Scaffold this motif. Structure first.
Motif, PDB file in Angstrom:
ATOM      1  N   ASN A  10       0.812  -1.201   0.000  1.00 17.18           N
ATOM      2  CA  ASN A  10       0.000   0.000   0.000  1.00 17.18           C
ATOM      3  C   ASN A  10       0.860   1.272   0.000  1.00 17.18           C
ATOM      4  O   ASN A  10       0.580   2.234  -0.692  1.00 17.18           O
ATOM      5  CB  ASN A  10      -0.918  -0.008   1.233  1.00 17.18           C
ATOM      6  N   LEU A  11       1.945   1.284   0.764  1.00 19.12           N
ATOM      7  CA  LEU A  11       2.810   2.485   0.740  1.00 19.12           C
ATOM      8  C   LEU A  11       3.424   2.646  -0.645  1.00 19.12           C
ATOM      9  O   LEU A  11       3.534   3.736  -1.208  1.00 19.12           O
ATOM     10  CB  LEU A  11       3.952   2.302   1.723  1.00 19.12           C
ATOM     11  N   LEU A  12       3.909   1.524  -1.193  1.00 17.15           N
ATOM     12  CA  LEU A  12       4.558   1.608  -2.484  1.00 17.15           C
ATOM     13  C   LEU A  12       3.622   2.119  -3.564  1.00 17.15           C
ATOM     14  O   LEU A  12       4.030   2.897  -4.416  1.00 17.15           O
ATOM     15  CB  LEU A  12       5.125   0.286  -2.975  1.00 17.15           C
ATOM     16  N   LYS A  13       2.390   1.613  -3.552  1.00 21.59           N
ATOM     17  CA  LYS A  13       1.342   2.102  -4.491  1.00 21.59           C
ATOM     18  C   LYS A  13       1.053   3.562  -4.291  1.00 21.59           C
ATOM     19  O   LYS A  13       0.952   4.302  -5.248  1.00 21.59           O
ATOM     20  CB  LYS A  13       0.004   1.389  -4.271  1.00 21.59           C
ATOM     21  N   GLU A  14       0.863   3.967  -3.044  1.00 27.67           N
ATOM     22  CA  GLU A  14       0.585   5.362  -2.809  1.00 27.67           C
ATOM     23  C   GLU A  14       1.666   6.281  -3.370  1.00 27.67           C
ATOM     24  O   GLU A  14       1.369   7.345  -3.895  1.00 27.67           O
ATOM     25  CB  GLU A  14       0.411   5.661  -1.344  1.00 27.67           C
ATOM     26  N   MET A  15       2.921   5.881  -3.268  1.00 28.60           N
ATOM     27  CA  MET A  15       4.018   6.757  -3.706  1.00 28.60           C
ATOM     28  C   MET A  15       4.258   6.675  -5.200  1.00 28.60           C
ATOM     29  O   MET A  15       4.717   7.614  -5.854  1.00 28.60           O
ATOM     30  CB  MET A  15       5.290   6.347  -3.013  1.00 28.60           C
ATOM     31  N   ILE A  16       3.891   5.552  -5.775  1.00 29.29           N
ATOM     32  CA  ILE A  16       3.926   5.523  -7.251  1.00 29.29           C
ATOM     33  C   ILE A  16       2.842   6.413  -7.855  1.00 29.29           C
ATOM     34  O   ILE A  16       3.118   7.203  -8.748  1.00 29.29           O
ATOM     35  CB  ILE A  16       3.816   4.108  -7.803  1.00 29.29           C
ATOM     36  N   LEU A  17       1.632   6.304  -7.327  1.00 24.73           N
ATOM     37  CA  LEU A  17       0.473   7.100  -7.813  1.00 24.73           C
ATOM     38  C   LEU A  17       0.613   8.594  -7.532  1.00 24.73           C
ATOM     39  O   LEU A  17       0.074   9.385  -8.264  1.00 24.73           O
ATOM     40  CB  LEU A  17      -0.842   6.615  -7.190  1.00 24.73           C
ATOM     41  N   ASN A  18       1.315   8.955  -6.460  1.00 31.78           N
ATOM     42  CA  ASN A  18       1.712  10.351  -6.201  1.00 31.78           C
ATOM     43  C   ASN A  18       2.970  10.826  -6.973  1.00 31.78           C
ATOM     44  O   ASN A  18       3.457  11.970  -6.828  1.00 31.78           O
ATOM     45  CB  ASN A  18       1.996  10.558  -4.694  1.00 31.78           C
ATOM     46  N   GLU A  53       5.474 -11.483  -6.958  1.00 28.86           N
ATOM     47  CA  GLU A  53       4.408 -11.110  -7.904  1.00 28.86           C
ATOM     48  C   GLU A  53       4.862 -10.266  -9.055  1.00 28.86           C
ATOM     49  O   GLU A  53       4.092  -9.998 -10.018  1.00 28.86           O
ATOM     50  CB  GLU A  53       3.294 -10.340  -7.244  1.00 28.86           C
ATOM     51  N   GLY A  54       6.123  -9.883  -8.985  1.00 28.99           N
ATOM     52  CA  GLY A  54       6.772  -9.192 -10.091  1.00 28.99           C
ATOM     53  C   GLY A  54       6.675  -7.690  -9.972  1.00 28.99           C
ATOM     54  O   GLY A  54       6.875  -7.004 -10.974  1.00 28.99           O
ATOM     55  N   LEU A  55       6.335  -7.227  -8.757  1.00 25.77           N
ATOM     56  CA  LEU A  55       6.249  -5.819  -8.405  1.00 25.77           C
ATOM     57  C   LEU A  55       7.569  -5.196  -8.008  1.00 25.77           C
ATOM     58  O   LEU A  55       7.748  -3.990  -8.113  1.00 25.77           O
ATOM     59  CB  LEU A  55       5.241  -5.641  -7.252  1.00 25.77           C
ATOM     60  N   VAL A  56       8.449  -6.027  -7.482  1.00 28.37           N
ATOM     61  CA  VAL A  56       9.739  -5.595  -7.012  1.00 28.37           C
ATOM     62  C   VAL A  56      10.766  -6.486  -7.694  1.00 28.37           C
ATOM     63  O   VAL A  56      10.542  -7.676  -7.811  1.00 28.37           O
ATOM     64  CB  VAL A  56       9.734  -5.755  -5.498  1.00 28.37           C
ATOM     65  N   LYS A  57      11.808  -5.879  -8.236  1.00 31.22           N
ATOM     66  CA  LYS A  57      12.970  -6.588  -8.746  1.00 31.22           C
ATOM     67  C   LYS A  57      13.998  -6.655  -7.706  1.00 31.22           C
ATOM     68  O   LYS A  57      14.349  -5.674  -7.100  1.00 31.22           O
ATOM     69  CB  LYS A  57      13.559  -5.943 -10.011  1.00 31.22           C
ATOM     70  N   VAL A  58      14.508  -7.855  -7.518  1.00 37.56           N
ATOM     71  CA  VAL A  58      15.534  -8.094  -6.523  1.00 37.56           C
ATOM     72  C   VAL A  58      16.869  -8.294  -7.182  1.00 37.56           C
ATOM     73  O   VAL A  58      16.980  -9.116  -8.080  1.00 37.56           O
ATOM     74  CB  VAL A  58      15.239  -9.362  -5.744  1.00 37.56           C
ATOM     75  N   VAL A  59      17.833  -7.472  -6.777  1.00 36.48           N
ATOM     76  CA  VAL A  59      19.224  -7.591  -7.182  1.00 36.48           C
ATOM     77  C   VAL A  59      20.140  -7.943  -6.011  1.00 36.48           C
ATOM     78  O   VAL A  59      20.519  -7.109  -5.179  1.00 36.48           O
ATOM     79  CB  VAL A  59      19.752  -6.365  -7.896  1.00 36.48           C
ATOM     80  N   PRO A  60      20.535  -9.208  -5.975  1.00 35.41           N
ATOM     81  CA  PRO A  60      21.181  -9.712  -4.766  1.00 35.41           C
ATOM     82  C   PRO A  60      22.464  -8.985  -4.505  1.00 35.41           C
ATOM     83  O   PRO A  60      23.187  -8.651  -5.426  1.00 35.41           O
ATOM     84  CB  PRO A  60      21.415 -11.186  -5.093  1.00 35.41           C
ATOM     85  N   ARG A  61      22.704  -8.738  -3.231  1.00 35.36           N
ATOM     86  CA  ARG A  61      23.819  -7.958  -2.778  1.00 35.36           C
ATOM     87  C   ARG A  61      23.709  -6.531  -3.278  1.00 35.36           C
ATOM     88  O   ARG A  61      24.582  -5.734  -2.990  1.00 35.36           O
ATOM     89  CB  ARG A  61      25.176  -8.566  -3.219  1.00 35.36           C
ATOM     90  N   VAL A  62      22.638  -6.172  -3.994  1.00 34.62           N
ATOM     91  CA  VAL A  62      22.514  -4.777  -4.469  1.00 34.62           C
ATOM     92  C   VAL A  62      21.335  -4.044  -3.817  1.00 34.62           C
ATOM     93  O   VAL A  62      21.513  -2.990  -3.288  1.00 34.62           O
ATOM     94  CB  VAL A  62      22.438  -4.683  -6.022  1.00 34.62           C
ATOM     95  N   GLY A  63      20.140  -4.612  -3.918  1.00 33.46           N
ATOM     96  CA  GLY A  63      18.976  -4.013  -3.373  1.00 33.46           C
ATOM     97  C   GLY A  63      17.742  -4.439  -4.090  1.00 33.46           C
ATOM     98  O   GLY A  63      17.735  -5.393  -4.903  1.00 33.46           O
ATOM     99  N   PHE A  64      16.688  -3.695  -3.768  1.00 36.77           N
ATOM    100  CA  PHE A  64      15.346  -3.903  -4.295  1.00 36.77           C
ATOM    101  C   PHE A  64      14.964  -2.674  -5.052  1.00 36.77           C
ATOM    102  O   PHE A  64      15.309  -1.574  -4.650  1.00 36.77           O
ATOM    103  CB  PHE A  64      14.327  -4.060  -3.204  1.00 36.77           C
TER     104      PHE A  64
END
Ligand code: NI
Ligand code: NI
Lengths: 209, 209
Positions: A10-18, A53-64
């Motif tokens: 929900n936070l992530l959606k809110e900040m994308i839509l804003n 679900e494919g909403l976040v890409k994960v880069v190991p040792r790097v971040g999200f």
């Protein structure tokens, strides 16, 4: 668990839509944690789920990172819904037509057509599409849809024509109540393909992608 | 990751099909670890994944159990496949009909009809059904199917009529190569519903459920 993922989501959606967060943007877990008042590990674990679900890409040792949601991501979302929802409506049609729930959703739909309150649209929109799925009584199906619901929800919000969508739902329900099974099915395809075309057009209004 | 889950999964299938493990039976993680030469944590993590597909029931602070696979679990598995595979074949029909792969599968099918080698059946069976999915080019769809593949695979094995299934695949492919799209679709429904009826009947041969 779903609980934390849903707040993170929900936070992530809110900040994308804003337009606070761009599509593709690297996520700062500490930030998310400050905003939500939830510790690091649980946030991290939610993000891993959303990556599922494919909403976040994960880069190991790097971040999200926030997925760089593009046309293909939208099209694939919608086509997946068409497959599942149409399959449910077609095969569980009598059960859907006879449910009292359908009648309450109809009432919300009529309110939106008059008020245009986005929250009532979202509630009624979710209930109608989920009713089709839930009427299968097939817990594998229902869990597949639930598993990608966050993706469905974010995609739902990347267009602005909810009042037109409201009218399309109205007509769907009308076909369904009339026992026009074939009409209903065609109308659901039409509604989703319409939503998909409008979303693809709106997409450039989002930073990146 | 898929790597460990697949070894864990493969052992579990082998012992269910040998009637070494009952449906519903509590799993002993140490046992699995001895058998596989894999440490506890990774096995535990695989089991959690399999629980995600509904193969393993997780009882927190208690343990992990083999699902008590029952008719509903079978029916739901098959109906989910019907929805996805039929959707793929119908909408990606030309692409499936034109693929060289289909021709190689056809060759395996002809070998089974003559030899009845179960391994060649399993390989050809997996390839044909997965071709339908893969031909969509829809990575969400393809990942949903992959996510439940272990469940599909275990269910596939709970019947014994693979040679008849081999003949049904043959006829499917024949309809497809002939451009009989509608015939092909009906044949796929028929094949899966047939497999489902036979599996439900065989099910009592498995300890428990
Ligand atoms: Ni809608
Ligand atoms: Ni088959």
């Amino acid at each position: 668990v779903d609980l934390v993922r849903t707040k993170v989501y929900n936070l992530l959606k809110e900040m994308i839509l804003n337009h606070e967060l761009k599509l593709g943007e690297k996520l700062n877990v500490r930030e998310l944690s400050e905003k939500l008042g939830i510790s690091f590990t649980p946030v991290r674990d939610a993000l891993l789920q959303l990556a599922t679900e494919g909403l976040v890409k994960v880069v190991p040792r790097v971040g999200f990172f926030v997925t760089d949601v593009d046309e293909k991501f939208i099209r694939e979302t919608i086509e997946t819904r068409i497959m599942m929802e149409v399959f449910c409506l077609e095969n569980y049609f009598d059960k859907i037509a006879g449910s009292e729930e359908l009648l309450e959703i109809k009432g919300e739909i009529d309110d939106v057509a008059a008020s245009a309150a986005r929250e009532i649209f979202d509630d009624s929109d979710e209930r109608l599409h989920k009713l089709f799925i839930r009427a299968s009584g097939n817990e594998l199906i229902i869990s597949l849809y639930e598993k990608i619901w966050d993706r469905i929800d974010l995609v739902r919000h990347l267009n602005e024509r909810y009042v037109v969508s409201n009218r399309e739902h109205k007509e769907l329900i009308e076909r369904i109540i009339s026992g026009d099974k074939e009409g209903a099915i065609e109308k659901l395809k039409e509604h989703l393909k319409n939503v998909e075309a409008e979303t693809i057009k709106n997409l450039y209004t989002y930073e990146r992608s």
